[PDB]
Symmetry: C5
Subunit: 65 residues, 5 copies
Amino acid sequence: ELEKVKAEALAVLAAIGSPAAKFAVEAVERDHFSAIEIAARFLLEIGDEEGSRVLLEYSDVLRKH
Amino acid sequence: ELEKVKAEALAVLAAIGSPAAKFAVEAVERDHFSAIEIAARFLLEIGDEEGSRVLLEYSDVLRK
Amino acid sequence: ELEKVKAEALAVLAAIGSPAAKFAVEAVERDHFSAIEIAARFLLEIGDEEGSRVLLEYSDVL
Amino acid sequence: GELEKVKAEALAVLAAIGSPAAKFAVEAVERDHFSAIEIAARFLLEIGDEEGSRVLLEYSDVLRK
Amino acid sequence: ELEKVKAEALAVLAAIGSPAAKFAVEAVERDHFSAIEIAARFLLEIGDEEGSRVLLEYSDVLRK
């Protein structure tokens, strides 16, 4: 279940190529709650709606089972 | 309780229409406490008090 | 103490009149720790030192 | 002891700054508010006061220990 | 494992020499989770991506 949304998140973030997305990818790869929160807030504070949206989706999936 | 205040909260957020509000709506519809907190803090620090107020109201209704 | 410091906080925030203080006011009325913290941090980052201070007092007493 | 000494040292460094952020910092130190200490430390770091943020880090690390 | 990643993290952060890095190094040597988090978030909004990434690595090792 997780292995699909993780791939979706890493692909979407790597596509962006922004230095904020590059951090985001790492925050996804290690499943770091604090790093994921920081990356989401930064992508929101920089203008990346796609990155923030996919981070929210992957975090909502991760929070459960 | 949450299902009642949520409707007006999402209506206000869609009314805002800012790309930050669009995140906010997503944060509200998925019931993500941390995402709601981040969206509220960002909407407050950009000048949208209208969004922050309804996020605070809906979050307090979710808490209690 | 709580019944006094809450009133002092609402009084100071109503005095400030900024749109951030109102949120702060609401943050006090609903007793939301995270909202109080956010309001204090914002009032500190905008220059309202007294509002952030009284929010800190009301949070520590609570 | 360690905390009773470092509290005084921290307040001494912070009072010299006189900044409204230090004025918050002292209150964050005297009232022992972990969250306020974090906010004050990040703000002094984000404005350029390395001494205040550093001494707040020391006092937080000894207080947290 | 942790004592291994600490050296690389401290070296990378010391190389930056920025006042944020001086904080970052201090955050690592004292093993302060909150300080590491603040330093990483600040280094992201200041332009040091390598510092934020290595802080994330050391913190992920630090959690366990």
